[PDB]
């Protein structure tokens, strides 16, 4: 992986720095590293395999070194370097694609493709040089069992889930108490509804609790909390739990009462936020507990009092909401996020070559299924393929 | 003035290079290039630059 | 004015070769016995013997 990344970085530096008119001293060390790479790769036969519709490709390396002959680089030098760089970039892209499409249950973090297994030999270790990218840095640190994290903007940590829980229900679904929620990507939009508006509650208070167990621990997370859940504030016709019938939801939004957001790690209260809205910081957590109360307004204007009678039928159903958005976080494990293209790149490569479903990832690299059952083997394979994809993105 | 066993063609080029190297008004980059510029002899290909 | 950038070139040639003049010196040429010499028609030039 480090040798593959070093090949990619050397090629990127060659493409960026070996330009017409540049001083010889701007490329001396680069020319040395590039010639070392050429010498190391020369005389080696590589094969990128035929998994799926990915074509079998053979790679031969017999390339002359780059001289150091002109004070300012000219067009001939750049043309020769470009020829060599184009061949090497094609080879690296094919190796990255071949590695991206494989997976293993046991040694998911180890190289899978023949080309990358060969590049892991001692003879190619000379190619290795500066490993500065976030993913290669994290890879190297993780290989040494050092604490390191990936920074995600809007981490895709919540598997998609749009469902409800009815705590009070009837066959006619006209006096309902429960909770709705959408957990999607970095967003948790939850709502608690009471059709009776807590008329018969012990203190005219109805308690709602939403617990979300994150599949990986998130640290240094910045989160936006908003009182209302816009997704559950309009009338809806909702299928029943079994799907036999459909019930009616006619929300009227009230201010959530005694809002408490608890970010827990190992069952301990790491962060607590009471009636606090806006931007909050969760240090290090793996569970979110949103507890909020629907309080029947003790004092109502005649219209409000008309909304909520003392008994059935209930035409307007009192709903309280909560919106949580993880804007950014740090996770020791790789995750899909809004700003990076690693999941997209791997999925596109697998789809465009009809890679048969393996024994590790879900079909089509479905992110909901992946994160839902984010096992250690899946984590290893995902980290490997994401690192390969990040390496590939430097050239393709 | 070569620091890497450099060679040049011809002796007149050597005289010119020494004169430019010793000149005080020469650019530092040109001086370093004279000190570093190298020939390339590929005996397998039967080529010399 | 003398400009180093405009005057520094790389001259390329071969490392070494040997130039030959008398090609036919590379040919070992012998002849049949004159008694057995034949003409264009594959018969002996002189047949009276
Ligand atoms: Cl955004
Ligand atoms: Zn953004
Ligand atoms: Zn139902």
């Amino acid at each position: 992986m480090d040798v593959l990344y070093s090949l990619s970085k050397t090629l990127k530096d060659a493409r960026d720095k070996i330009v017409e008119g540049t001083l010889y001293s701007n490329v001396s060390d680069l020319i040395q590293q590039f010639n070392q790479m050429i010498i190391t790769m020369n005389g080696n036969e590589f094969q990128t395999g035929g998994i799926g519709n990915l074509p079998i490709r053979n790679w031969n390396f017999d390339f002359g070194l780059l001289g150091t002959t002109l004070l300012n680089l000219d067009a001939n030098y750049v043309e020769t370097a470009r020829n060599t760089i184009d061949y090497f970039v094609d080879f690296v892209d094919n190796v990255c694609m071949d590695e991206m499409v494989r997976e293993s249950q046991r040694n998911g973090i180890a190289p899978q493709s023949d080309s990358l297994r060969k590049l892991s030999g001692i003879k190619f270790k000379r190619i290795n040089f500066d490993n500065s990218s976030e993913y290669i840095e994290n890879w190297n640190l993780q290989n040494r069992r050092q604490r390191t994290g990936f920074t995600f903007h809007k981490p895709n940590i919540f598997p998609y889930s749009a469902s409800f829980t009815l705590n009070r229900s009837q066959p006619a679904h006209d006096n309902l108490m429960g909770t709705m929620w959408l957990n999607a990507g970095s967003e948790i939009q939850v709502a608690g509804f009471d059709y009776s508006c807590a008329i018969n509650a012990p203190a005219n208070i109805q308690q709602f609790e939403h617990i979300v167990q994150l599949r990986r621990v998130l640290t240094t997370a910045t989160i936006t909390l908003l009182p209302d859940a816009e997704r559950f504030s309009f009338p809806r016709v909702i299928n029943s739990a079994d799907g036999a019938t459909t019930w009616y939801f006619n929300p009227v939004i009230l201010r959530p009462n005694n809002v408490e957001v608890e970010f827990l790690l190992n069952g301990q209260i790491i962060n607590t936020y009471q009636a606090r809205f806006g931007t909050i910081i969760a240090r290090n957590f793996d569970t979110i507990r949103l507890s909020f109360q629907l309080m029947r307004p003790p004092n109502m204007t005649p219209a409000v009092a008309a909304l909520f009678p003392n008994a059935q039928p209930f035409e307007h159903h009192a709903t309280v909401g909560l919106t949580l958005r993880i804007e950014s976080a740090v996770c020791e494990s790789v995750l899909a996020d809004a700003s990076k293209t690693m999941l997209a790149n791997v999925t596109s490569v697998r789809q465009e070559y009809a890679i048969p479903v393996g024994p590790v990832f879900p079909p089509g690299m479905n992110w909901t299924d992946l994160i839902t059952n984010y096992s250690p083997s899946r984590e290893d394979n995902l980290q490997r393929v994401f690192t390969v994809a990040s390496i590939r993105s430097m050239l393709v | 003035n070569s620091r890497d066993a450099g060679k040049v063609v011809d002796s007149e080029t050597a005289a010119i290079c020494d004169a430019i190297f010793q000149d005080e008004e020469t650019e530092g980059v040109v001086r370093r290039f004279i000190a570093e510029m190298r020939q390339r002899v590929q005996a397998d290909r039967n080529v010399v630059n | 004015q003398f400009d180093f950038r405009a005057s520094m070139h790389m001259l390329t040639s071969n490392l070494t070769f040997t130039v030959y003049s008398d090609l036919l010196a590379f040919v070992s040429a012998d002849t049949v016995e004159p008694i057995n010499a034949v003409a264009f028609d594959n018969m002996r030039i002189m047949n009276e013997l």
Side-chain angles (χ1 to χ4, degrees), chain A residues 342-358:
Chain A
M342 260 78 66
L343 176 75
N345 274 122
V346 175
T347 308
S348 324
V349 171
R350 290 183 163 243
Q351 289 166 341
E352 196 240 354
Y353 296 112
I355 306 304
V357 67

Side-chain angles (χ1 to χ4, degrees), chain A residues 23-25 68-71, chain B residues 29-30 32-33 36 38 40:
Chain A
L23 269 181
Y24 70 99
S25 43
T68 164
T69 55
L70 290 204
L71 189 147
Chain B
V29 77
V30 172
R32 180 130 79 79
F33 182 73
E36 282 162 328
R38 264 287 300 197
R40 189 172 71 261

Side-chain angles (χ1 to χ4, degrees), chain A residues 134-350:
Chain A
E134 205 221 32
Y135 265 71
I136 198 65
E137 282 184 4
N138 275 318
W139 181 270
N140 292 137
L141 292 158
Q142 171 246 8
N143 283 331
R144 299 166 39 200
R145 197 72 189 72
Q146 310 304 310
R147 166 58 165 260
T148 188
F150 301 86
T151 306
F152 300 107
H153 170 51
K154 290 174 74 184
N156 208 310
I157 187 51
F158 303 129
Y160 175 84
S161 187
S163 46
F164 57 88
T165 284
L166 291 171
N167 299 113
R168 186 177 63 229
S169 181
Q170 303 92 19
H173 293 80
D174 53 293
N175 189 40
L176 296 186
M177 192 271 287
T179 37
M180 283 170 200
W181 61 86
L182 171 71
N183 305 346
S186 48
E187 217 214 357
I188 282 163
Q189 234 159 336
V190 67
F193 50 92
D194 197 348
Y195 279 29
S196 76
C197 195
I199 189 84
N200 293 341
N204 312 319
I205 288 268
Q206 182 55 244
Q207 186 68 62
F208 305 99
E209 189 141 277
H210 193 39
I211 286 153
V212 185
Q213 299 275 356
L214 279 69
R215 317 289 158 134
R216 288 290 184 287
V217 171
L218 291 188
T219 78
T220 309
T222 201
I223 289 126
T224 293
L225 211 81
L226 297 173
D228 317 308
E230 279 165 47
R231 195 162 167 99
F232 305 120
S233 49
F234 45 90
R236 296 159 72 81
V237 174
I238 297 138
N239 69 267
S240 63
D242 200 324
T245 195
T246 41
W247 46 289
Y248 178 47
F249 192 48
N250 196 45
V252 52
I253 304 319
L254 272 59
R255 198 215 69 153
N257 189 258
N258 263 278
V259 169
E260 273 127 28
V261 194
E262 276 182 351
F263 297 87
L264 303 318
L265 186 74
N266 248 340
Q268 309 266 111
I269 307 266
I270 308 312
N271 271 112
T272 284
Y273 291 100
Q274 276 137 322
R276 168 63 65 189
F277 297 113
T279 294
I280 44 170
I281 304 297
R283 289 170 26 207
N284 167 31
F285 70 102
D286 54 15
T287 308
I288 315 188
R289 187 181 146 291
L290 308 144
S291 82
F292 49 105
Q293 293 173 346
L294 189 128
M295 181 195 267
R296 187 193 186 76
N299 307 334
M300 325 175 139
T301 43
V304 181
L307 292 171
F308 317 108
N310 293 288
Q312 308 186 38
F314 297 121
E315 306 188 309
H316 310 275
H317 316 136
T319 323
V320 284
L322 273 194
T323 304
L324 197 148
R325 267 174 227 276
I326 299 160
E327 317 287 55
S328 68
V330 176
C331 183
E332 285 193 48
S333 315
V334 293
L335 294 168
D337 77 318
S339 309
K340 304 176 225 198
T341 324
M342 260 78 66
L343 176 75
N345 274 122
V346 175
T347 308
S348 324
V349 171
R350 290 183 163 243

